[model samples]
Target: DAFVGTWKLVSSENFDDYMKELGVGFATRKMGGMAKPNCIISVNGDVITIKTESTLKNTEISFILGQEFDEVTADDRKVKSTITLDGGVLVQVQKWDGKSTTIKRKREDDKLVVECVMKGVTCTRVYERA
Candidate 1:
């Protein structure tokens, strides 16, 4: 509901666990660990645009609520996803490589809670206002 504006990742938990479940290699994990990501989201009516910027790359995705669209990630991975709101939380459901992934975000205390689930592993990344 209130998920608009810019967010920068301050900490990531279970990074290796989630990546391992996603089958990301050691080298990729190392690179990702060294990168700092900033995410920006804008809402207009029922449409949402999200931009992820990092040292490695930048990715922008836009879609209408409940409508699936092709998403080419900065890492060069392609997927299809839909975004919806549940209460005050923004939920994203993504389909990639024959797998279904889910990510949810909401404001918690003074931080942003980002929860990502894939291959039975859940990774929570926290972002603070910058």
Candidate 2:
């Protein structure tokens, strides 16, 4: 229940390079860089839904814990994704075309901290409860 709420973006670091690692084009990366996305997380029984909304795009993904599912990412890449909960952190792993990335979301007091890692680059995005 820690992550189940509306969270607004407070800050982001090195996201463009993270997008580049995912093969996102320049135009998309520029727009992504300028957009401030809000995350809305919810849970029903064992199913969890994470939705992100912004001026440029809106995306939602729902899944049961430990189940592998196909996901068309916000950046438009099709990948296999699995989510797991470890203590207070929600960890998501996505794989596509022999490449993989990890996204970790955890709550730090009143803030939500998101870390996206691909290859050697990591992007950190901070959010405050809205």
Candidate 3:
């Protein structure tokens, strides 16, 4: 799987805006910006596991492809989520607090791209192979 590898964060845009809109505390918001995150992704058959590590916190989420599951996000919210792979794009949808958010991960040439969208906000984070 092309997306199943370690990725080191290079740049992030508009993440603070989305965190603010989601009502993250000012200190946590500041903390999130201080360090880049690295992602370790593993794919086995239909199961995919993702782990993100950073200075502030670390989180791991596992799910079956296209199957709904109760999961928790790095933002610390309980969500019903599902992930699908379509046309080289890995898309994940999380529903919580009567709303939903989407994360799309894809490769653009040599860079790994992850976009987090909430309401009207979209944050694009670029990463490189680790």
- Which candidate number maximizes TM-score? 2
Q: Show pairs that collide, candidate 1.
A: none
Model 3 misplaced regions, further than 4 Å: none
Residue-wise C-alpha lDDT for candidate 3, range 1-130, written one tens digit per residue: 7887899999999999988777688887888876699999998887899999998799898888889999867767899998998898989998888988899999898788999998999999999998
Candidate 1 root-mean-square deviation in Å = 1.7
Write candidate 1's Cα lDDT for 22-130 as tens digits.
Answer: 6677887777766778989888887788888888778888889788899875445688888887888889887886888788998898788999898778889998876
Tell me, by lDDT, which candidate is best: 2
Indicate whether candidate 1 or candidate 3 has the larger lDDT. 3
Ranking by TM-score: 2, 3, 1
Candidate 3's C-alpha lDDT? 0.88
**For every candidate structure, what is the RMSD over all alpha carbons to the true structure, in angstroms?**
1.7, 0.6, 1.1
Q: Give the C-alpha miss distance for residue 16 in model 3, angstroms.
A: 0.2
Each candidate's lDDT (Cα)? 0.81, 0.95, 0.88
Candidate 1 lDDT for residue 71: 85
Q: What is the TM-score of each candidate against the true structure?
A: 0.88, 0.98, 0.94
Q: Which lDDT value does model 2 have at 38?
A: 95
List pairs with backbone clashes in candidate 3.
none
